[PDB]
Design an enzyme around this catalytic site. Structure first.
Site, PDB file in Angstrom:
ATOM      1  N   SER B  39      13.258  19.167  54.998  1.00  0.00           N
ATOM      2  CA  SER B  39      12.052  19.350  53.882  1.00  0.00           C
ATOM      3  C   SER B  39      12.146  18.028  53.078  1.00  0.00           C
ATOM      4  O   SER B  39      11.799  17.028  53.525  1.00  0.00           O
ATOM      5  CB  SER B  39      12.435  20.676  52.977  1.00  0.00           C
ATOM      6  OG  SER B  39      13.759  20.656  52.839  1.00  0.00           O
ATOM      7  N   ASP B 150       9.963  25.058  57.524  1.00  0.00           N
ATOM      8  CA  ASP B 150      10.932  24.391  57.088  1.00  0.00           C
ATOM      9  C   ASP B 150      12.196  24.349  57.792  1.00  0.00           C
ATOM     10  O   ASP B 150      12.462  25.554  58.019  1.00  0.00           O
ATOM     11  CB  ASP B 150      11.058  24.117  55.599  1.00  0.00           C
ATOM     12  CG  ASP B 150      11.393  25.235  54.817  1.00  0.00           C
ATOM     13  OD1 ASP B 150      11.598  26.407  55.404  1.00  0.00           O
ATOM     14  OD2 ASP B 150      12.140  25.249  53.585  1.00  0.00           O
TER      15      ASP B 150
END
Lengths: 253, 255
Positions: B39, B150
């Site tokens: 991320s 993610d």
């Protein structure tokens, strides 16, 4: 040898547990302890309170699932009402070891992630807390803890049952099937999938601790949805047939 | 001198602290030979690997318009895609991530299987975007037939990925993933996110326990920092800078 019964967490698939119970009583296998999560805690706890498998089957068949202020709050209330009504005879009980069969239920403290094991208090509230699937039922507060279902920390509480003092565990694993990328269309689906992954990991870890003597039952439930209450007969029978075929091995208990 | 891998843990706003770390790392003359990220770790790390300086990253972060039991974002995904595509126009698609100014890996989760997916080639903005696909904030993206969110839930602190890039030592930045208090859990969304935070912390600690002597953990002081609180970018960056400045002696032992 003391025999503990471990009923894994889930929703509709957990109805298969009834089948298992129906088979066990049919084979004269005595259970000395029961540990459960969510629907495992519902079926296992109702059984532990004094219900017969036949009674649980009847209750499951006559239940208006589709029917049973935020929606999760309302459905939480309905859940609580149904459980309280079914378990009214345990009104004056406080010690889960003093039920017809000793019982433990498993929840997750949603503030800390800690496993919470219910061994005392109010049985319907403990079962409700253990059954409180996020995005279906609002979290329940017990003794200052905000609680959701135990699935994400201990979906197959083998060690809880062992901690109850049993020598051997019969473990029923109804599975937590992942969704295909076609069934991951919304945010809710993604979240639920994540939770499923979590649950599967802790479940695998607990299953790896099974030892010679323990019996693992995995009812054939491929294709059964998590919220598929329109197939209660097949769900119960799946759990029943999976236990019946193991009667040779179970008889040694 | 040993090859140094940099591991940047995942998150959102707190991830900006990585910039501070970078600012300090360059200031102490620590050469990074490989970067693995999840991320915001993949965003900062990936922009850095593509040649951006820490000062430039700080300027970008400082000038960015980040603003784009109760019951519970494709557009957000599109805008993220736009900003990343804009920042990375100097790189094409069909590119080996080992051929960047600094070799780079980004981490995502195949939401269908739960498998870790590590990007080492392709379109850098797309890979970073995939790594940044936080559920309930950014819609999942499709790459090579896979639906991706993610990487936080499977590998939030990708130490072994960095090691797989063939480094000898790793510098590992854990910006943390704090749980909300009981009082702060109001929406169903909050509960779901809390569970994700839990599994993230589990895999994170499993990776962290594998750090060997020689490796260096940098844990920026981000106690009261909200996960999506972009109102304190200076403080966020300074935290990463302070944390790396404090560990200057340990880090000096790397080179």
């Amino acid at each position: 040898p003391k025999i503990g019964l471990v009923l894994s967490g889930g929703a509709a698939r957990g109805l298969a547990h009834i089948g298992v119970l129906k088979a066990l009583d049919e084979q004269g296998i005595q259970i000395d302890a029961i540990a459960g999560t969510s629907m495992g805690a519902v079926v296992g706890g109702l059984y532990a309170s004094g219900y017969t498998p036949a009674e649980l089957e009847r209750i499951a068949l006559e239940m208006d699932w589709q029917q049973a202020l935020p929606l999760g709050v309302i459905q939480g209330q309905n859940l609580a009402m149904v459980l309280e009504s079914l378990l009214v005879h345990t009104s004056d009980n406080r010690d889960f070891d003093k039920l017809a069969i000793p019982f433990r239920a498993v929840s997750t403290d949603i503030a800390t992630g800690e496993k919470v094991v219910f061994r005392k208090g109010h049985l319907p509230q403990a079962i409700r807390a253990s059954m409180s699937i996020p995005a279906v039922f609002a979290p329940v507060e017990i003794d200052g803890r905000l609680l959701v279902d135990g699935g994400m920390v201990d979906n197959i509480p083998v060690d809880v049952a062992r901690d109850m003092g049993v020598d051997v565990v019969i473990v029923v694993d109804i599975g937590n099937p992942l969704r295909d990328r076609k069934d991951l269309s919304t945010v809710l689906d993604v979240m639920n999938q994540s939770i499923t992954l979590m649950t599967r990991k802790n479940s695998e870890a607990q299953l790896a601790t099974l030892k010679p003597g323990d019996v693992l039952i995995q009812p054939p439930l491929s294709g059964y949805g998590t919220t598929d209450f329109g197939r209660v007969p097949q769900l119960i029978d799946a759990g029943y047939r999976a236990t019946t075929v193991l009667a040779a091995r179970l008889a040694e208990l």
